[PDB]
């Protein structure tokens, strides 16, 4: 995938290693993928495939990444972890919602980041943790 490229569909995507199926309704309050033990207030979704693939790859869990197309029941807002942080605005088109979402499809035709790019991201995040700089906004 290409960073900042909006998916053809305009649809909201959710990358995860959870075993979801079309027709599931997902409510907030599951555990963070980035800070063990943290109970989440939001569901995180995106309109770029690149951000969804990172969500699938970086999600906690055994088993492979999945990307779902989802329909929010309620309001969505910019995800502050990636908005006005490294870049101005929200170029990854990443959002979050306090209300449930429905799983309406599964994206089957994606490929992951090349392995050294995924390893660099993983290593970078462990480093931020080791330095106490991995602040999670939620």
Q: Which residues bind ligand RFP (CB under 6 A)?
A: 3, 34, 51, 54-55, 58, 81-82, 85-87, 91-92, 94, 121, 124-125, 128, 133-134, 136
HEC secondary structure over 78-112:
ECHHHCCCCCCCCCCCEEEECCCEEEEEEECCCCC
Q: Which residues of 8-33 are buried (b: 16+ CB within 10 A; e: fewer)?
A: eeebbbbbbbeebeeeeebebeeeeb
Residue 1: DSSP 8-state: -
- C-beta of 28 vs 91, nearer to ligand RFP: 91
Shortest reach from residue 49's CB to ligand RFP, in Å:
11
Contact indicator for 66, 35 with CB cutoff of 8 Å = no
* Closest CB 17 distance from ligand RFP, rounded Å: 12
CB of 119 to ligand RFP, least distance (A): 10
Q: Point out the residue whose Cβ comes nearest to ligand RFP.
A: 124
If the CB atoms of residues 54 and 103 are measured against ligand RFP, the closer one turns out to be: 54
């Amino acid at each position: 995938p290409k960073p900042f490229e909006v998916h053809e569909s305009g649809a909201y995507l959710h990358g995860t290693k959870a075993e979801l199926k079309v027709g599931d309704r997902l409510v907030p309050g599951r555990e963070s993928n980035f800070e063990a033990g943290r109970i989440m207030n939001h569901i995180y979704i995106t309109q770029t495939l690149d951000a969804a693939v990172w969500g699938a790859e970086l999600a906690a869990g055994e088993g492979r990444g999945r990307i779902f197309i989802v329909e929010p029941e309620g309001a969505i807002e910019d995800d502050p972890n990636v908005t006005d942080k490294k870049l101005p605005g929200n170029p990854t088109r990443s959002y979050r919602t306090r209300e449930p979402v429905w799983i309406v499809g599964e994206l089957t035709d994606w490929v992951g980041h090349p392995p050294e790019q995924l390893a660099a991201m993983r290593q970078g995040l462990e480093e931020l943790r080791r330095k106490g700089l991995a602040v999670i906004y939620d």
